[PDB]
Design a protein around this ligand. Structure first.
Ligand SMILES: [Zn+2]
Ligand SMILES: [Zn+2]
Ligand SMILES: [Zn+2]
Length: 249
């Protein structure tokens, strides 16, 4: 008597990272997701989400070992847009009717993000990884426009509780893998316009903007036949602009 709502969506976006050598920065990305909003007190609810995203990576070779070559200064040390990523989220929600035309919902919960990227170097094919446990808060408004039409501006903010960057370098004779804590945060903003058509079913669409940042890691070193070497995982800043299309059951 205040229904379960299930939304499946797809986004098409332009995503870019933080490159320091006049490179092409933009990548096409796509994400698919499902959200379940399940009421339990009918002011209060649970929100669950799962998602899967991809961007194409194009093979670009690099001349380095362990992944830091013959001379120290700066040249790898891979970060940027992930090739594949999955996200999961579970949280609680609270919804208030502001007027007969307007609903206000806020929520908070726990999220998990895991992504992978493949790197091909002369000697190796390495895989980088970013795995993050995070806290997320979200807020949105649902305003009725008439005839079943609605607009739904939304926002969310997240911050890492424990986010780690990994690179399977022990495979490229450092004999040791890289696993460094790299906490950050992110935010998202958008607005959907939709049409609630003939009971329980809605179609909606709208633009969105997202930003994700990971802080530079603490210092660490590795073992090279030609030495110890100092490494930092670089501050990483991702920006996404896109179009989301969703179906709400
Ligand atoms: Zn570009
Ligand atoms: Zn999405
Ligand atoms: Zn090697």
């Amino acid at each position: 008597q205040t229904a379960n709502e299930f939304t499946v969506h797809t986004d098409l976006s332009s995503i870019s990272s933080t490159r320091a050598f006049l490179k092409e920065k933009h990548k096409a990305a796509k994400h698919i997701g499902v959200r379940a909003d399940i009421p339990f007190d009918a002011n209060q609810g649970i929100r669950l989400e799962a998602g899967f995203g991809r961007s194409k990576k194009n093979i670009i070779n690099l001349e380095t070992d362990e992944n830091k070559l013959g001379k120290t200064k700066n040249v790898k040390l891979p970060t940027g847009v992930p090739e594949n990523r999955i996200d999961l989220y579970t949280g609680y929600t609270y919804t208030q009717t502001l007027s007969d035309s307007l609903n206000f919902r806020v929520g908070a919960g726990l999220g998990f993000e895991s992504s992978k990227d493949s790197i091909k170097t002369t000697k190796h094919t390495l895989h980088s990884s970013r795995q993050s446990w995070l806290a997320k808060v979200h807020a949105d408004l649902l305003s009725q426009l008439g005839n079943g039409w609605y607009i739904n501006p939304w926002s969310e903010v997240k911050f890492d509780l424990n986010s780690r960057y990994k690179l399977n370098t022990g495979v490229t004779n450092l004999k040791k893998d890289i696993n460094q804590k790299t906490n950050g945060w992110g935010f998202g903003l958008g607005a959907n316009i939709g049409k609630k058509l003939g009971e329980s079913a809605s179609i909606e669409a709208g633009p969105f903007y997202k930003q994700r940042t990971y802080k530079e890691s603490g210092e660490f070193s590795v073992t090279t036949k030609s030495g110890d070497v100092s490494l930092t995982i670089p501050k990483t800043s991702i920006r996404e602009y896109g179009l989301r299309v969703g179906i709400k059951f």
